[PDB]
Scaffold this active site. Structure first.
Site, PDB file in Angstrom:
ATOM      1  N   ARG B  76      89.053 -28.751  -9.805  1.00 20.27           N
ATOM      2  CA  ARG B  76      88.594 -29.952 -10.472  1.00 20.27           C
ATOM      3  C   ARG B  76      89.683 -30.446 -11.401  1.00 20.27           C
ATOM      4  NH1 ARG B  76      85.589 -30.797 -15.471  1.00 20.27           N
ATOM      5  NH2 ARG B  76      84.677 -32.896 -15.436  1.00 20.27           N
ATOM      6  N   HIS B 120      89.058 -38.711 -18.063  1.00 23.60           N
ATOM      7  CA  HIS B 120      89.016 -37.548 -18.934  1.00 23.60           C
ATOM      8  C   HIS B 120      89.776 -37.853 -20.224  1.00 23.60           C
ATOM      9  CE1 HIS B 120      88.156 -33.005 -18.615  1.00 23.60           C
ATOM     10  NE2 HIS B 120      88.315 -33.298 -19.892  1.00 23.60           N
ATOM     11  N   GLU B 165      82.106 -36.049 -20.051  1.00 18.59           N
ATOM     12  CA  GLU B 165      81.564 -35.884 -21.397  1.00 18.59           C
ATOM     13  C   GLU B 165      81.633 -37.144 -22.255  1.00 18.59           C
ATOM     14  OE1 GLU B 165      83.657 -32.661 -23.039  1.00 18.59           O
ATOM     15  OE2 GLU B 165      82.609 -31.125 -21.874  1.00 18.59           O
ATOM     16  N   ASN B 290      78.919 -29.485 -18.299  1.00 24.39           N
ATOM     17  CA  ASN B 290      79.879 -28.737 -19.089  1.00 24.39           C
ATOM     18  C   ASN B 290      79.114 -27.967 -20.154  1.00 24.39           C
ATOM     19  OD1 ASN B 290      81.711 -30.053 -17.505  1.00 24.39           O
ATOM     20  ND2 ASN B 290      82.753 -31.135 -19.167  1.00 24.39           N
ATOM     21  N   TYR B 292      79.131 -24.445 -22.927  1.00 20.36           N
ATOM     22  CA  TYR B 292      79.911 -23.425 -23.609  1.00 20.36           C
ATOM     23  C   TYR B 292      79.061 -22.559 -24.525  1.00 20.36           C
ATOM     24  CZ  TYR B 292      84.005 -25.968 -21.974  1.00 20.36           C
ATOM     25  OH  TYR B 292      84.959 -26.572 -21.191  1.00 20.36           O
ATOM     26  N   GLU B 351      82.300 -27.207 -16.002  1.00 21.51           N
ATOM     27  CA  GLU B 351      83.092 -26.503 -17.007  1.00 21.51           C
ATOM     28  C   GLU B 351      82.301 -25.391 -17.669  1.00 21.51           C
ATOM     29  OE1 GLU B 351      85.030 -28.713 -20.030  1.00 21.51           O
ATOM     30  OE2 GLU B 351      85.822 -30.250 -18.679  1.00 21.51           O
TER      31      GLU B 351
HETATM   32  O1  LIG Z   1      86.816 -29.387 -26.071  1.00 20.63           O
HETATM   33  C1  LIG Z   1      86.815 -28.159 -25.379  1.00 20.63           C
HETATM   34  C2  LIG Z   1      86.967 -28.404 -23.890  1.00 20.63           C
HETATM   35  O2  LIG Z   1      85.699 -28.722 -23.334  1.00 20.63           O
HETATM   36  C3  LIG Z   1      85.390 -30.010 -22.825  1.00 20.63           C
HETATM   37  O3  LIG Z   1      84.807 -30.815 -23.828  1.00 20.63           O
HETATM   38  C4  LIG Z   1      86.555 -30.745 -22.186  1.00 20.63           C
HETATM   39  O4  LIG Z   1      86.241 -31.083 -20.853  1.00 20.63           O
HETATM   40  C5  LIG Z   1      87.806 -29.910 -22.202  1.00 20.63           C
HETATM   41  O5  LIG Z   1      88.895 -30.696 -21.778  1.00 20.63           O
HETATM   42  C6  LIG Z   1      88.008 -29.466 -23.621  1.00 20.63           C
HETATM   43  O6  LIG Z   1      89.292 -28.913 -23.754  1.00 20.63           O
END
Ligand SMILES: OC[C@H]1O[C@@H](O)[C@H](O)[C@@H](O)[C@@H]1O
Ligand SMILES: OC[C@H]1O[C@@H](O)[C@H](O)[C@@H](O)[C@@H]1O
Ligand SMILES: OC[C@H]1O[C@@H](O)[C@H](O)[C@@H](O)[C@@H]1O
Ligand SMILES: OC[C@H]1O[C@@H](O)[C@H](O)[C@@H](O)[C@@H]1O
Lengths: 447, 448, 448, 447
Positions: B76, B120, B165, B290, B292, B351
């Protein structure tokens, strides 16, 4: 009385390839008419637009003539290939500079410049990519439009996109009498669709980067009944649909006329809905080019509308073979008003007649009494249309100059100013003089 | 407990143009908002810029060989708008586009599925000078840009992301000003969000007209958990949730804007014309998530504009970006997302990854990152859990393939499963990349 | 020593729309960049906004009576662009235009000359969404706006200002972000400065086509004096001088941009097309000087972007805005300005005054501001001195008629010769106003 | 989802003079409404509260009706003149015995009794002593309060002091549309002040001899912008100050709104500091009566606020001419939460709507779909307010029964139970049925 409404705009019209000459001068690219006119058999007497009225060099004199005629407006076209030689890409500075000087000269003279983006002279480089058969043309045209929209912002306030889609397609792709000289119903259907799409794209681009008013210019030839025979009425509707409703209806958001399905048969196509959304992009004004009427009857062997006009021997005919019949103008103006809901400001962007004139002046005069008659009767017909509530904002005589009547060459003179094509000498005709009085008296001279 | 993934489940890794490419002014390429932002003092950690980054523009072949070693099935990546169309509108730059042509052909030759993202975060500066995301006309600009790619890679790139995002773009770029173009305004933030959504819709329509394959947007979601049973804290939670997670998803699902936004943005909030929402809700083929971490917001009267703030969850490990490590919230989120999209929309984790400290150079040919490995296995297991609960999950992309420029935080935050020595541009595969290669090869069976 | 001023020398006072009017979005009025900026937390001291200010939109008649009590012969004011054209382009707002219509007729009836300013920092937000001063089309937008005024007030407003202080607009608004629209970028600063100059030119041309009277720009100048004999300090002085005092004046005089700017802005500096400079240098009829103080810059390698900083001149009094009081520097500046314009361009001091502490309410019907009185007497004397040195100075406007909103510094800085109680909107003429009234009445003889 | 917090109390509300009848029966004294309603011209159709719903005799039936509706609370007022005929002095045993029977009957049914001390029916003997214009009323009221506080100790735990000070003063003393029918700004200012003082005195007395929670009940009608005209914003703030802030502000220790100085002019007064200490006596809860919003514009001849509401034709209006606009409820609750610092528990003690119903059932049914709609949307709005952190503990529908809408007579039906005033026959409306379902499902019926 025949005094016209306040602010009603009187002017005259021309087109680039028909008057300019210098087709390859100062960086200008090759257009489809450069190719077409230099192919044997295509043009009457082998005429070309190589010199025409030499307007590219004599525009200053021509503007002095516009002032002598009391013109308030001059409608002209911009040669795409003169401005963008390959149709896309690098702009030609000198080519654009010509129209720059022209427009400044017009504004200095107090004449409103009415610019038309496309008047039948597609760049050959784009024709080699399929021309109006290539959907990408919608973008090309838009980009081209942008170049002018930005260049003449605040100077050119009234814009025409396409001049007579029907002539472009029916002449250029259906019967092949005009450049690029194709003869195909399949191609005719596709080309018509992409012309409409190009108009829409140009209007959108105008909304993004332009200033003022933009619209398309349609020619209409009203079809009258030959009889009460049903086959003749079906014929009339086929002809009317193919010529008068083909472009107007989708522009008004009503889709394509049903009759086209019968007219083009297997060549007819269904198009995506968003295409029709693009095509019906709201405009600010509309131009009508009008000359005559027709009386179609059934004709089974007439491809593709299966109709043919009945000669109206009770009336005078022009040298282009067009019946002289002023009421049909009023009617047309009424009809169009209805089709646009009375909501769209209308302007007669072309009206005039071709009669024989000698190739030279006769001691400094050209006596064209039939052209004078045509002028006065049809302008009166305009007054009649306004009296019936049609929102008519102006009138442009075709044409300011005797010029190249495309494939019919220089044999058909439409000018109110005579051009001696041997000497490039201009002579104001009696019709021009009279038109000068109509403008001057704002119509009161018809009384 | 078996952890084999569904047949056809796609494993890959992700990057973004400004974060890896370098050569920002090379071969006709235009100036972007990040060229400007990164070269203005005070904006970037250690004064880092994207001038060189991973030198990917020159080393893409090596990077593809690295993809091969990792057994990647997908890559990607994003296309730099200003590299392809220097002024954002108008003339195309042949070499800039040729780069991506080369890259895509190279990927397909290697048997790697190219997943392309249109935007992006690297808007052309020429368009920013025309108002950027504050100018409604951008919806058209983007569409045209989209078309250029859709036609150029027709039949080669089958999976398209429109915007990556929207929340980071708007919240970071227009609300608080930590990201390019560095504006700080609620008034501008609402407008920018709206026009980002409109641009997405326009791009999807243009894709229907001229494109081939599947297209969708990519949203980041950070699930908001209760800090307490106090009512002001639940109100805070819903404000934060509305501003971050529902702002874009809801109008995309035809549900309009979250009501709470009226409270979050106050006088800066606006009503927009009805047809805008018709454009915005233009049906998509798939959606990217995405993900985290999670947050635990509590009431915070002085925190502008959501009046909420996260409570530090000291019971768990935290990454170098300060994000709590808590895998169940991934599963929950996926379920939640499945519900919000009605289960009808195929989802992909576009992501997922973590930042931990790595040395700037390899250590005897190695980089040992056990915490990144841990994050990887636990969150991939969490994906399996989400799939078992009926979520239509089609793939997983690790952020990131390479250590890269973490925007305003510079090169200090390493997300790569491949280590990059930024002094020498030398690549070294980390233990995490290694493990991930084993996960792909065994299609998840290594986790059992 | 006599201080009688030349025949026809015009005495007056000045204001700006957002600083005094209030009712910012009232009666059809549009949103401006200051509406947005002032309502974003952190931007304004004490969270002050221009929502009420001096409530001048409602109390303009009382204010005119106050002008008459002060013996004013002229009133310099600005017109809010967004009040007259809510979206910046397109439809005119009748009520908004009607306000200034009433104001101008009232001024002329009182025998007071209306001096109108087209742009005093309050750009319509709708145009800012199109890029604002970064969009070259603004040159046209401004012109059209100008036309609306030129024709509406033809024969009534004979003296026109185009732009008030390009340097504050660009340096404050685009370079450092202390003023609306709050951008911080050298790239944007360079572009914005260029387009402000272009807009001035366009307005002057339009004025030649449809307007009547005299038109000019208004520049602020802060003369830079030597800090030492160190050559790096002189280089610093020249950088600061070029960036602040010569940036706009030089191209306005047809001398192009100062060479030093290439050094100040570095990679952000740009070359612009030659015809732009033909437009920028359109012949004007007069020029306004806004003047308050001087600076003594020294080298400062870490100071972005001029790498210079002022040395505090502790031997002299400083205003509450921290500006040194040094009247001779006014004389010098005028002379300097006279030299830069070849003596051919009629000059007027469109702003001069000082901020000192005043109580929030009057004290038995009085406000005693002896330092403001002192500033006034010494600087007016400096004006006379400047005229004796050959400056073609036609007038003087005190900033300000009213205590008002000092932009980002809020209401804490009082510049008025008329005190405004912001709790009650009560006006009380200060001792400085009384003295200025006597100065006008005696045409300077009171200074004898 | 719409499930409400645990312990959220659902109920319905009435007022003594509006439903009881038997106004001077069984020892009961004369009230100001006894006089007012029997003076020609004061009441629509000459309606009086002589009979009303005959509740004094039919309260048991009405309790059975409460049970069918699943009510958890019944908010009612006590007639001062029924309990203490001369307002001061001797207690009337029978009058108090009625409310004793009622409270015991409610507790027996498991329904929480919510008692209001004053709902507009001042004893005539006290009006002859100046009524709310006599500061001594603060003491009188306290004594009256004490009588109830001690009689119902341990049975009635939730107490309201004054129901809607603004209606009492604005209607009764400013404009004269309500009893005692005075029209005077001077008197309005004085009366408002003494109502607030009476509230404070009652709260103090409650602290000394009472048990449970005590609070005041305010009506609020949020004022929204009519335009961007500044005279209209000044109008909005005047109206807002006179109606919504007049009482709340001194109750919160903020003194009287500054705008009142402008509204009442020479009639405005400054009062002693200790008055404001008394007025701000800490309370346990607050009641909000809410129905609608207003959109005021400037109106120079409208005395004394110089404002008037603009008709919002885009929305439905009740038979009382009140706009139906549920979001304004949510907003108001938030506003109130803010004005009270979020620390004071709130309850909507009145919310409902008046629509036309026939005077008799059909067939043993009353179909009132707009009242049902009002009900569901406003209850949903309550839920929205709770989701934003407002400490809202309950909801009372106005009203349990169709009753006497004071000076507008019986023409305005607010009941979720229909009353045939010819026969005293009760019929539960569709709104009552729906409300019963809302209580049962604790909000789940809304989803
Ligand atoms: O900000 C932390 C990461 O997560 C996402 O928001 C983005 O796709 C990445 O490019 C970024 O480096
Ligand atoms: O045929 C006469 C004229 O017809 C018009 O409709 C066309 O626009 C002209 O180009 C042409 O000269
Ligand atoms: O910075 C102080 C003052 O500077 C002046 O030159 C501006 O015209 C004023 O609006 C401002 O109040
Ligand atoms: O106007 C309708 C209702 O309004 C309420 O605020 C009063 O408390 C009731 O007594 C009245 O019936």
């Amino acid at each position: 009385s025949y005094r016209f409404p306040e602010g009603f705009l009187w002017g005259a019209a021309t087109a680039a390839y028909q008057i300019e000459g210098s087709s390859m001068a100062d960086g200008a690219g090759e257009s489809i008419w450069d190719r077409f006119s230099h192919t044997p058999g295509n043009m009457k007497d082998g005429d070309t637009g190589d010199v025409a009225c030499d307007h590219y060099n004599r525009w200053r004199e021509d503007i002095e003539l516009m002032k002598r005629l009391n013109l308030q407006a001059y409608r002209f076209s911009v040669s795409w290939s003169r401005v963008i030689p390959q149709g896309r890409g690098a702009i030609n500075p000198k080519g654009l500079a010509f129209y720059d000087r022209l427009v400044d000269g017009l504004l200095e003279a107090g004449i409103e410049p009415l610019a038309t983006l496309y008047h039948w002279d597609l760049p050959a480089a784009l024709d080699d990519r399929g021309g109006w058969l290539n959907p990408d043309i919608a973008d090309w045209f838009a980009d081209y439009g942008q170049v002018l929209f930005e260049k003449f912002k605040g100077r050119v306030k009234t814009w025409g996109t396409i001049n007579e889609p029907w002539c472009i397609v029916d002449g250029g792709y259906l019967h092949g009498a005009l450049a690029p000289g194709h003869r195909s119903a399949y191609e005719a259907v596709i080309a018509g669709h992409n012309v409409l799409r190009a108009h829409g794209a140009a209007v959108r681009r105008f909304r993004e980067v332009g200033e003022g008013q933009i619209g398309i210019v349609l020619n209409i030839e009203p079809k009258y009944p030959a009889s009460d025979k049903p086959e003749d009425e079906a014929a009339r509707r086929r002809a009317e649909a193919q010529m008068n409703r083909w472009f107007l209806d989708p522009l008004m958001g009503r889709g394509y006329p049903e009759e086209l399905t019968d007219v083009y048969g297997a060549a007819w196509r269904e198009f995506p809905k968003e295409d029709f959304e693009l095509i019906a992009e709201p405009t600010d004004w509309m131009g009508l080019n009008w000359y005559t009427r027709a009386v179609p009857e059934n004709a089974p062997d007439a491809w593709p509308t299966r109709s043919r006009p009945v000669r109206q021997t009770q009336h005078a005919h022009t040298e282009t073979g067009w019946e002289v019949y002023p009421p049909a103008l009023t009617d047309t103006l009424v009809w169009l008003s209805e089709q646009t809901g009375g909501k769209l400001p209308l302007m007669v962007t072309e009206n005039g007649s071709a009669w024989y004139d000698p190739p030279h002046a006769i001691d400094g005069r050209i006596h064209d009494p039939m052209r004078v008659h045509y002028l006065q009767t049809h302008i009166k017909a305009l007054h009649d249309a306004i009296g019936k509530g049609v929102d008519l904002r102006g009138y442009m005589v075709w044409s300011l100059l005797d010029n190249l009547e495309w494939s019919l060459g220089y044999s058909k003179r439409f000018g109110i100013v005579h051009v001696n094509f041997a000497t490039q000498e201009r002579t104001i005709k009696d019709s021009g003089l009279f038109y000068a009085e109509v403008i001057k008296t704002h119509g009161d001279v018809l009384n």
